[PDB]
Amino acid sequence: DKKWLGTPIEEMRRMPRCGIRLPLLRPSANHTVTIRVDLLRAGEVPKPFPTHYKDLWDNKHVKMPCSEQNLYPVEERTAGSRWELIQTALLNKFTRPQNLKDAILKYNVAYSKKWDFTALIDFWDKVLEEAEAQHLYQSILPDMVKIALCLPNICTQPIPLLAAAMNHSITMSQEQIASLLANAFFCTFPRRNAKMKSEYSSYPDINFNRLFEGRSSRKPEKLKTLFCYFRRVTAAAPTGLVTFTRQSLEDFPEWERCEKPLTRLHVTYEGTIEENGQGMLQVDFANRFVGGGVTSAGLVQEEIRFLINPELIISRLFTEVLDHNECLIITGTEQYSEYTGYAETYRWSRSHEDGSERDDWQRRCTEIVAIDALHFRRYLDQFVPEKMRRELNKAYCGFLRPGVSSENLSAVATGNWGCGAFGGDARLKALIQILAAAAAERDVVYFTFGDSELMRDIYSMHIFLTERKLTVGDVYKLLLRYYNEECRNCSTPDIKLYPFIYHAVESC
Numbered sequence: 001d002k003k004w005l006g007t008p009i010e011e012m013r014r015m016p017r018c019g020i021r022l023p024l025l026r027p028s029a030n031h032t033v034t035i036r037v038d039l040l041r042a043g044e045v046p047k048p049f050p051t052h053y054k055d056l057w058d059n060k061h062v063k064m065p066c067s068e069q070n071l072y073p074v075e076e077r078t079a080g081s082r083w084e085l086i087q088t089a090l091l092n093k094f095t096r097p098q099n100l101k102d103a104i105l106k107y108n109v110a111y112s113k114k115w116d117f118t119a120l121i122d123f124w125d126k127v128l129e130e131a132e133a134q135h136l137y138q139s140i141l142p143d144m145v146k147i148a149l150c151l152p153n154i155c156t157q158p159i160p161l162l163a164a165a166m167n168h169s170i171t172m173s174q175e176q177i178a179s180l181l182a183n184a185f186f187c188t189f190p191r192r193n194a195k196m197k198s199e200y201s202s203y204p205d206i207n208f209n210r211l212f213e214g215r216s217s218r219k220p221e222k223l224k225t226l227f228c229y230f231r232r233v234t235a236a237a238p239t240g241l242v243t244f245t246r247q248s249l250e251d252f253p254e255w256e257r258c259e260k261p262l263t264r265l266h267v268t269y270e271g272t273i274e275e276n277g278q279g280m281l282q283v284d285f286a287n288r289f290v291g292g293g294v295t296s297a298g299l300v301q302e303e304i305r306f307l308i309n310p311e312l313i314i315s316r317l318f319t320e321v322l323d324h325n326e327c328l329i330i331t332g333t334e335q336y337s338e339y340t341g342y343a344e345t346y347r348w349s350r351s352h353e354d355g356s357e358r359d360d361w362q363r364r365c366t367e368i369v370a371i372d373a374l375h376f377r378r379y380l381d382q383f384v385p386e387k388m389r390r391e392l393n394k395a396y397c398g399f400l401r402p403g404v405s406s407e408n409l410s411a412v413a414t415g416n417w418g419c420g421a422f423g424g425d426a427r428l429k430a431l432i433q434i435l436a437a438a439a440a441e442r443d444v445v446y447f448t449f450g451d452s453e454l455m456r457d458i459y460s461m462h463i464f465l466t467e468r469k470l471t472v473g474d475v476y477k478l479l480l481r482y483y484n485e486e487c488r489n490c491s492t493p494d495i496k497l498y499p500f501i502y503h504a505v506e507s508c
Ligand SMILES: Cc1ncc(Cn2c(=O)c3cc(S(=O)(=O)NC4(C)CC4)ccc3n(CC3CC3)c2=O)s1
Pocket: 271, 272, 273, 274, 300, 301, 302, 304, 305, 341, 342, 415, 416, 419, 447, 448, 449, 450, 451
């Protein structure tokens, strides 16, 4: 009973080994760089560029909590500095969870009856042992406040929003990320709270207040994972960089006419994308709002990655909701925790010491792409040509690196994308990803997460199409025939996709 099938994993392209020498890092129209590139050195904390805080309070940039324009009404007409109120509120000793709740609410007065702190109170009072709670309020929380309040000295450059249709990159230091994330913990980002807000209505939540609500047994696990990160980065400043790239394609292939052959496949029911997919493009089965319910209740594939690699969470500050033709590529995030389980069985296990090498820009050699699958009301909706074409184009966009040659592209480490709650058919999604990877000229490493039968079926299908030398176009036309013969006229399907494919090819 083989645990993997196909091309051996050692034969698949990894990184930075099979990842081209980087050009000089520099800001440009499509690339924001928030650190001194001339001073970038291995093992040294990057220096912010510019030296002194420069503020932009407008529609194209993150509205910073430390901004002079971040004001609150006081009474007559006297507008007060919200930043000064944040400083005053957070520079108090917290001995009990109520003190933390009270501090947060001082600069979020409008949410005093709307924000529930039950999970935070229960974590501190009912989950943590006496010594763990003491360490939290005597050392972790004061160290989080200091780095949150250091924000104007750390993030001196305005952060542009990665808005819809923009092809833009942001490179920032892990230290800048820690200061920003300690702010999101203290719920200091302005204009990101109202349910009826229009300005940021198409942006994910960034303030962590939903992580403090309710009684889910999973909240202490999310909190343990995040405090593990905060304890690590406040004790010793991380020295690397992280790049966030929004990619939007205009020109999509005419799939039915794609003459490209299929690429190699490694398929396994054992292993994980983060451990066994090192040096490979790692897929995040994202929500259109990147990170999904990470700052609230979600605990599936995406949320877990965002908890163990917390630097991914800051994409929520500046990443607008993904359109059908967009993806977010994140390079350099570091893994700080290890975990067990998934969803309702998820547990934080221990601290992780990330062994990844850094590239020439001091970024950990870890590339994660966020690609959001569709949510299908009815099962058969996914076989609609427009819905199949959408999934192909989404995966293709996440996998394509325009300009880069095929021999310099690592394999894609992916799995059961859009399954469970979203209603995706694993056999169809596996084919869709195999076709998009072929069009993008990358090999596929596929994880079926315990489903041994799915591993065997994907392998048998792949070997069948490969041996018959069917192109991407040939396979896409078989998907169009399936819809037509079995799904279009279907009122209740009679025949499953893979049997249909074997029959259609073998009888032709
Ligand atoms: C047959 C199925 N298809 C989807 C399913 C959901 N699912 C996953 O998607 C899953 C993803 C990863 S991972 O490699 O993507 N790593 C993460 C979580 C991102 C940090 C790891 C574990 C997963 N487990 C639990 C395990 C099978 C027992 C799971 O149950 S189970």
